[PDB]
Amino acid sequence: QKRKRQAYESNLICTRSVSDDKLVFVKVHAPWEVLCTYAEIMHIKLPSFFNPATRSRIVYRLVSSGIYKAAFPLHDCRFNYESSERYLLYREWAHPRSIYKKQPLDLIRKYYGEKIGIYFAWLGYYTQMLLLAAVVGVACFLYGYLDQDNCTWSKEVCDPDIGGQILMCPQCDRLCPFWRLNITCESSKKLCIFDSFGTLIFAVFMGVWVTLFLEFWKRRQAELEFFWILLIIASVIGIIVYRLSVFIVFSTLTPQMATSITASIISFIIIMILNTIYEKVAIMITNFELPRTQTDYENSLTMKMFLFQFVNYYSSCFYIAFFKGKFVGYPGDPVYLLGKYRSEECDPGGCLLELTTQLTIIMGGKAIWNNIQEVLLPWVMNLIGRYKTPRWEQDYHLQPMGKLGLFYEYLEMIIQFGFVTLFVASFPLAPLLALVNNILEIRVDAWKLTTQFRRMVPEKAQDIGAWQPIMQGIAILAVVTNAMIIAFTSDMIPRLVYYWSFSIPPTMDGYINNTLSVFNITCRYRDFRNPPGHPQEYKHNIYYWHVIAAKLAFIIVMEHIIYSVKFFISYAIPDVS
Amino acid sequence: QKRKRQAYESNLICTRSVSDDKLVFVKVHAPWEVLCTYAEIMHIKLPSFFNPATRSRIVYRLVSSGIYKAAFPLHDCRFNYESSERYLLYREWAHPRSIYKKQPLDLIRKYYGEKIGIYFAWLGYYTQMLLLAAVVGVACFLYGYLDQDNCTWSKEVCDPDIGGQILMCPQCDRLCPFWRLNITCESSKKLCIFDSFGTLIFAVFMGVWVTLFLEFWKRRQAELEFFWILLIIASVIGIIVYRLSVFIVFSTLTPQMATSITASIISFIIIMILNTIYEKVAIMITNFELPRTQTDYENSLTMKMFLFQFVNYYSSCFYIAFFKGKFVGYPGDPVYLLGKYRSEECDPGGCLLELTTQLTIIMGGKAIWNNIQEVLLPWVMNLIGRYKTPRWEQDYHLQPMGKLGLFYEYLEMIIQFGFVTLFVASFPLAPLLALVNNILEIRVDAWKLTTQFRRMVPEKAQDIGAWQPIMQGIAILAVVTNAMIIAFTSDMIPRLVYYWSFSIPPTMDGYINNTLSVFNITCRYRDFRNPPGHPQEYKHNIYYWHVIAAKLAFIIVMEHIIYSVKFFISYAIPDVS
Numbered sequence A, B: 001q002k003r004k005r006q007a008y009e010s011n012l013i014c015t016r017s018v019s020d021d022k023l024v025f026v027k028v029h030a031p032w033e034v035l036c037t038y039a040e041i042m043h044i045k046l047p048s049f050f051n052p053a054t055r056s057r058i059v060y061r062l063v064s065s066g067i068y069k070a071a072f073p074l075h076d077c078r079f080n081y082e083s084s085e086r087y088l089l090y091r092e093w094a095h096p097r098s099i100y101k102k103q104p105l106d107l108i109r110k111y112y113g114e115k116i117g118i119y120f121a122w123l124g125y126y127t128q129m130l131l132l133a134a135v136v137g138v139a140c141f142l143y144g145y146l147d148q149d150n151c152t153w154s155k156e157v158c159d160p161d162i163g164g165q166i167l168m169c170p171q172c173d174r175l176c177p178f179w180r181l182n183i184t185c186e187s188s189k190k191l192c193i194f195d196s197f198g199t200l201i202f203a204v205f206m207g208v209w210v211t212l213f214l215e216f217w218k219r220r221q222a223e224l225e226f227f228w229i230l231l232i233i234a235s236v237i238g239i240i241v242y243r244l245s246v247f248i249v250f251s252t253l254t255p256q257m258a259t260s261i262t263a264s265i266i267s268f269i270i271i272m273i274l275n276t277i278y279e280k281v282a283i284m285i286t287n288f289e290l291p292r293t294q295t296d297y298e299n300s301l302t303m304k305m306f307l308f309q310f311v312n313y314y315s316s317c318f319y320i321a322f323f324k325g326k327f328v329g330y331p332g333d334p335v336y337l338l339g340k341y342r343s344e345e346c347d348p349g350g351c352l353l354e355l356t357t358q359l360t361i362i363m364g365g366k367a368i369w370n371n372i373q374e375v376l377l378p379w380v381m382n383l384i385g386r387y388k389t390p391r392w393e394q395d396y397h398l399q400p401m402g403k404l405g406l407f408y409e410y411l412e413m414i415i416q417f418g419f420v421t422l423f424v425a426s427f428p429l430a431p432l433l434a435l436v437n438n439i440l441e442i443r444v445d446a447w448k449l450t451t452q453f454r455r456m457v458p459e460k461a462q463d464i465g466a467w468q469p470i471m472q473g474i475a476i477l478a479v480v481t482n483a484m485i486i487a488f489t490s491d492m493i494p495r496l497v498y499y500w501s502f503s504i505p506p507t508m509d510g511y512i513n514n515t516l517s518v519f520n521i522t523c524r525y526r527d528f529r530n531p532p533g534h535p536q537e538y539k540h541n542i543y544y545w546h547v548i549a550a551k552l553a554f555i556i557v558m559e560h561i562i563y564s565v566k567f568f569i570s571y572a573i574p575d576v577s
């Protein structure tokens, strides 16, 4: 026990704490010749001469068994008062009062290390790219807002004659009664913002913006040089079925917004606690496997953890986008999934607004609650530690960062990126919310890393790591996902077909009465079905196949055009300075 | 003049020809210490000790101005009789009598050099992969042939009652008279081969096969370690308009096969002479640009030359596939392209058979005529040279390879690959024809390289070069192109919709009368148009939009499924030994 530690200390050669007599901490420094020897064995760069991050790396499992209590570097100074580097970049960068200043990226790679430097460089560059995407999203938001007097469909669903005379079918078995449509008017008014031509121009822009983000980040990186799959499928089913359950336990502006916000909040609570669960089961799964190296361990953990997180966070959104209300048929013979399991018909405006509210609640709530957790949990852990003098004694009573470190940090921003990219065709303010989150996110990551956490050992990484193929896969998936959101989720394509193709005798006015289908009780539900009385009644009509062929042709045209533009831009940008 | 050559020879130090007194050839050898010095300046590998390819590279513009007559290595021996390496791999590899033996790839990199070795390794591995793709293509060809008694549509177009009672519309202005359909029966019978379920399984297989080809070739490479764009657009228009012209100058089994084979032959003749033209204008264009290095010169030449060759060879095929007969409307108001320019309505079986004949003529004729040129042109040039003793005198009178060398060789196989991949859904025997071409292609490239050409200087290349992104782009384009061939070119999707979707009251029998549309003279042309007498007469009907929505959904499903399978296979194959 103590013999192993004494022999290891004698090999390393080859004070106790004033507050706790049982703990003893040994100072570790290197001589000049030994530093030059370790700097020859590890080929460091050249122009007191060795930097403190370089010294702490060159000086850098036995503590995993519990023999050694703690091994760490030491901070330079207290942040609250000057001794003095930590005080400096706390005073001008890490403080929330210095929210507007530029990041001292050379100072952050000086003090913390190039993985922390590359995370904060990626975070700041993400913020600057999100500023461009956010002002274009504000431009398309103004395009939707100022043309609210020209959206003919919202003005005729808000008018009582065209909108109120619908009396559309119930989406629900026990009474849930059939209703005049003008009550969705206050939900439809903002819908003129959320699927107009402005958000289509924004989505086609956002494909290009993701491409520019990736290529100029490649340039900035160039400058700055089997049971678990079955469990994932069970998770895929689980998030959808509790999305249904939270909508049901709610079901037993104001009414629709209360519905969407309340169900989104309670589902988001389940999302967070199931996220902690998924952290634990994925770490148990990758510990059941034997990984040979820590890097292969964290790559496998990155893939499995991100797949569980992808499933957990976006499966509700994918249900609302592509599965909710998409497979329901006519009110005669509704689709009972397993018997007595009638699926949820959507509102006639579409499930885009419900997707929008769920997106902004999950995104902004993960932002708010994750920053609250990132502040408070190390702070309250240090507080209950302090409720139970030398420098290293002060630096001892800090929550250690962990073996992974910045991993979860990257993870949450990648999840934020999946809201910025995969669902950007729903609401254009996703880069704005991401920007206002990221401006504080640099400060909260900075502040907890400076104040609350022990100093992580500096070590260089040439990129973000295994998150880069994840981001490229998210980028390729974003084109398909935005195409299915504009085609399948929103209703922009049916009114596009109504204006361009059926103002003709075989304008935009008269769209709402001409879209829906009348239903015999043996009301006008939202579907394109040949009507009681037509020879092919309740089968899909000519107009269903016209609109769905325009949907599929839009998916093909938009995907091929955007993928060729992404190819032309990745081929045209030299990817170097 | 002679002073520059004398000074260069004196720097190099730092016999005349018996047949021609004006020419003098100096032997060039290196001493042992100078060879070790050049082998230290160029870091050669280690285990008379320096190999002859290595010696010829280490010993290796003034001849471009015309000062030096010729500078070359020397061959080891005459091929016809032993002196003796060249005689050996001529006797057992390069001879056409050794067509069945394996390639001595270590001997070919010993004698010729690693670019020639990697071309012949790529050629042989291409041949072995084509053997697998060819036996699967023969399997789907047997699937189409043995089920010829079960193709209901061909048996009812060959029957006089269902097929002969059509009397379909003329595709032509001056009389070209309307005709009973059973005359396409002998063309439709083999059509039961060419678009059945077997070729669909072959196309979905061929996406996987291209993927396996690319990944195992990555493994084998790992083991074996602005005016011109406007001219390209003018070429794009030019090949299509002379495809129209050769069809017209023909127009002024037996009748349709005579048409297709004759027009394909005369167009292919124009293809070849315009290919020589495109060689010359592309070499003039890349000489008008100043390239800094020979490698950047040949990369730019590779891109421009392949783009011109792509346009030249496949623009006729792309016209037949995606533009011929696709944009023609109903016989009332035909599409005159510029006035008095009625486009060519296709046969009711589709333009797939015309595409098939054009493909096999262009592919097999480029194979035959390119091997005939590859044999004869160096042979006849050496013959007229000989119509006007030491070793170097014999090796002097050979056609030199040129500065590019194997470039055109790679080029033609890449063009062959574009027939193996981009149009594989038309006829499944494309890998078979490629296999029977490649077995002789190794021998003709081997034989002309051994007998007729001067020995190219050995120099190492780690891959095929700039053709590898070209092949990956051809591979990505192949999925889209095969999807548009199965959907848009062939008629497999309309009969798939007829069987699965309209045997119902709103079997495969009755497909031909139910596909076409009747035409009032104010006959049954091949289109899906609402009929004289329907309220929406000659507009597209329900069934057009059903079939074209199934086409577009097939494109989306097939592209996404195949691209995910390609991603799973490229991610699952470790790309290393």
Ligand SMILES: CCCCCCCCCC(=O)OC[C@@H](COP(=O)(O)OCC[N+](C)(C)C)OC(=O)CCCCCCCCC
Binding pocket: A322, A325, A326, A327, A328, A329, A480, A481, A484, A488, A526, A527, A528, A548, B553, B556, B557, B560, B561
């Ligand atoms: C890679 C991640 C993204 C995957 C996207 C999944 C797409 C699923 C959407 C889907 O198929 O929905 C079925 C319909 C959508 O048209 P809708 O008119 O919404 O369906 C009827 C609903 N309503 C009458 C009550 C208004 O659509 C169809 O009927 C056509 C089916 C073709 C879909 C193929 C897309 C991608 C395949 C992998």
Ligand SMILES: CCCCCCCCCC(=O)OC[C@@H](COP(=O)(O)OCC[N+](C)(C)C)OC(=O)CCCCCCCCC
Binding pocket: A553, A556, A557, A560, A561, B322, B325, B326, B327, B328, B329, B480, B481, B484, B488, B526, B527, B528, B548
């Ligand atoms: C990248 C290299 C490959 C490019 C492929 C180009 C595709 C062009 C094919 C095309 O659009 O043809 C028009 C129709 C095809 O349906 P058809 O029924 O052949 O057209 C009517 C012909 N007929 C009545 C005489 C029998 O199709 C349509 O009407 C739907 C238009 C959507 C096409 C979008 C595909 C790719 C866009 C870049």
Ligand SMILES: [Ca+2]
Binding pocket: A366, A367, A368, A370, A371, A412, A441
């Ligand atoms: Ca956060």
Ligand SMILES: [Ca+2]
Binding pocket: A374, A409, A412, A441, A445
């Ligand atoms: Ca963070």
Ligand SMILES: [Ca+2]
Binding pocket: B366, B367, B368, B370, B371, B412, B441
């Ligand atoms: Ca050839």
Ligand SMILES: [Ca+2]
Binding pocket: B374, B409, B412, B441, B445
């Ligand atoms: Ca050849």
